[PDB]
C-alpha atoms as one frame of an Amber mdcrd trajectory, in Angstrom:
protein
  58.709 137.485  74.433  58.401 136.233  78.014  60.783 138.235  80.211  59.376
 137.459  83.673  57.881 134.510  85.542  55.827 135.231  88.676  54.917 132.605
  91.276  51.896 132.487  93.566  53.223 132.313  97.109  52.889 130.366  99.309
  50.588 128.085  97.327  52.926 126.960  94.559  55.999 126.802  96.839  55.056
 125.276 100.207  54.039 121.600 100.141  50.473 120.739 101.166  51.831 118.001
 103.431  54.226 120.411 105.131  51.407 122.940 105.511  49.121 120.329 107.088
  51.792 118.948 109.403  52.912 122.447 110.391  49.370 123.580 111.114  48.538
 120.451 113.058  51.536 121.224 115.264  50.282 124.797 115.711  46.947 123.533
 117.038  48.586 120.861 119.205  50.563 123.604 120.932  47.517 125.869 121.193
  45.543 123.131 122.919  48.146 121.331 125.008  46.178 118.948 127.207  42.752
 120.376 126.343  40.286 117.494 125.568  39.784 118.567 121.942  41.156 116.616
 118.988  43.678 119.035 117.422  42.750 117.809 113.953  39.120 118.768 114.554
  40.186 122.235 115.672  42.335 122.502 112.559  39.528 121.390 110.272  37.250
 124.070 111.716  40.030 126.677 111.567  40.398 125.848 107.866  36.642 126.174
 107.283  36.587 129.643 108.859  39.786 130.899 107.202  38.659 129.576 103.824
  35.394 131.529 104.156  37.272 134.672 105.231  39.804 134.530 102.392  36.915
 133.989  99.969  35.066 137.031 101.307  38.089 139.338 100.994  39.204 138.197
  97.525  39.639 141.198  95.245  38.874 143.608  98.086  40.933 146.251  99.894
  43.759 144.845 101.987  43.112 143.960 105.614  45.700 142.577 108.036  45.752
 138.785 108.194  46.696 138.857 111.880  43.394 140.531 112.758  41.509 138.041
 110.580  43.124 134.959 112.130  42.934 136.320 115.675  39.184 136.790 115.282
  38.925 133.245 113.914  40.806 131.885 116.934  38.637 133.960 119.276  35.566
 132.337 117.713  37.085 128.863 118.045  38.245 129.442 121.620  34.796 130.566
 122.767  33.211 127.714 120.790  35.293 124.931 122.322  36.262 126.504 125.639
  40.055 126.439 125.505  42.173 129.442 126.408  42.503 131.933 123.581  46.137
 131.780 122.369  47.502 135.311 122.690  50.704 134.039 121.033  49.001 132.314
 118.091  50.892 134.366 115.513  54.242 133.649 117.153  53.465 129.930 117.469
  52.602 129.902 113.760  55.896 131.529 112.762  57.890 129.115 114.935  56.111
 126.087 113.464  56.452 127.246 109.850  60.210 127.651 110.331  60.639 124.112
 111.649  58.031 122.306 109.583  57.640 124.368 106.424  58.644 122.295 103.416
  59.108 123.374  99.811  57.853 121.247  96.941  60.849 119.172  95.789  61.455
 121.066  92.546  61.053 124.679  93.724  64.706 125.627  94.171  65.703 123.925
  90.913  63.021 125.820  88.999  63.735 129.190  90.589  67.464 128.723  89.948
  66.910 127.785  86.297  64.931 130.972  85.649  67.237 133.408  87.462  69.279
 135.521  85.076  67.313 134.390  82.041  64.046 135.883  83.306  62.785 138.134
  86.071  61.762 135.752  88.849  58.967 137.258  90.905  56.648 136.302  93.768
  53.057 137.557  94.250  51.202 136.843  97.484  48.101 137.802  99.414  50.171
 137.573 102.616  51.195 140.725 104.378  54.727 141.836 103.657  56.191 140.877
 107.041  54.619 137.416 106.868  55.728 136.964 103.263  59.335 137.803 104.129
  59.287 135.528 107.178  57.943 132.721 104.969  60.673 133.116 102.355  63.316
 133.491 105.068  62.216 130.332 106.881  62.449 128.288 103.658  65.703 129.909
 102.559  64.467 131.295  99.254  64.145 135.026  99.820  67.135 135.871  97.606
  65.923 133.628  94.761  63.338 136.272  93.784  63.999 139.496  91.915  60.703
 140.927  93.199  58.317 140.209  96.053  54.880 141.813  95.672  52.187 141.646
  98.332  48.550 142.642  98.788  49.678 145.045 101.521  51.818 146.898  98.989
  49.162 146.946  96.244  46.322 147.660  98.656  44.080 144.860  97.371  43.892
 141.095  97.480  44.048 138.916  94.413  42.440 138.683  91.946  42.371 142.487
  92.019  44.412 143.747  89.041  46.497 146.214  91.048  48.666 143.583  92.731
  49.566 142.150  89.312  50.057 145.622  87.866  52.477 146.457  90.674  54.393
 143.202  90.167  54.792 143.983  86.459  55.960 147.538  87.177  58.545 146.294
  89.671  59.906 143.974  86.982  59.689 146.673  84.297  57.877 144.375  81.858
  54.555 144.465  80.069  51.841 142.005  81.019  52.271 140.270  77.667  55.924
 139.661  78.636  55.071 137.863  81.880  53.827 134.489  83.067  51.957 133.932
  86.309  52.058 130.474  87.924  49.157 130.090  90.296  47.722 127.575  92.727
  44.100 128.650  93.183  41.715 128.790  90.186  42.444 134.611  92.077  45.284
 133.470  89.815  44.024 132.657  86.318  41.967 135.836  86.440  43.610 138.940
  87.788  46.772 138.112  85.847  44.944 137.598  82.548  43.306 141.002  83.049
  46.813 142.466  82.670  47.628 140.381  79.587  49.827 137.890  81.464  49.982
 134.236  80.471  48.309 132.151  83.173  49.678 128.766  84.227  47.651 126.740
  86.716  49.597 124.372  88.945  47.427 121.295  89.573  49.740 118.692  91.107
  47.026 116.130  91.883  44.770 116.811  88.886  41.934 117.871  91.195  41.121
 121.209  89.504  39.975 119.974  86.079  36.735 121.924  86.516  38.732 125.171
  86.265  41.464 124.311  83.735  39.805 126.318  80.949  40.403 129.482  83.028
  44.180 129.045  82.525  46.358 129.243  79.429  48.398 126.217  80.546  48.040
 123.546  83.228  51.076 121.885  84.824  51.452 119.304  87.589  55.134 120.120
  88.301  56.869 123.501  88.299  59.617 121.993  86.133  57.083 122.189  83.291
  57.055 126.006  83.437  60.499 126.552  81.917  59.511 124.303  79.016  56.344
 126.340  78.406  58.251 129.628  78.523  60.925 128.312  76.161  58.195 127.201
  73.751  56.464 130.585  73.941  59.790 132.244  73.118
């Protein structure tokens, strides 16, 4: 019997278009009048952050601020613009204004509340995770918020999923995990959770077999849970 539904944050909640627009604005403010195409800076920032997040997957927690600040130091020395001492603050200010939930998020979270334990699991630090939820107005829609900083390890390490389950007071077999990255269908299945992969654009077909179910819209989750029960 499914008693809890956990969501991968921010990946299944924040729209890719809002993320891209928000981050483009971050780099525009970082650069100002500097003769560097902000989109090029962003592309290279994404290359470096993607590599970093890949290297730390499953490993002991390390602060994301230090990671991103070192990335921006490498980009500043590479391109010659002034290193943004306020990069973290710029990011928070731009996520508040330009962060955008997928259209169905609130509906889905509301439909699960009461019926099931609605949880969030994220590799973000706790402060960042709370600021993210606060900016998008959905902090109180979750019964639990579990972070890598609390567990001590990044996904797909089992401990972050184990902690989420213990917060909810449910067994792995009683929980679903809805995940964006094909870190998700892995650490959660190690705890006996049912793994749902969110693939909105159908661009992850190579990794579908790693998940128990594949959805393109979070509104499909409630249907899957109801069918399981």
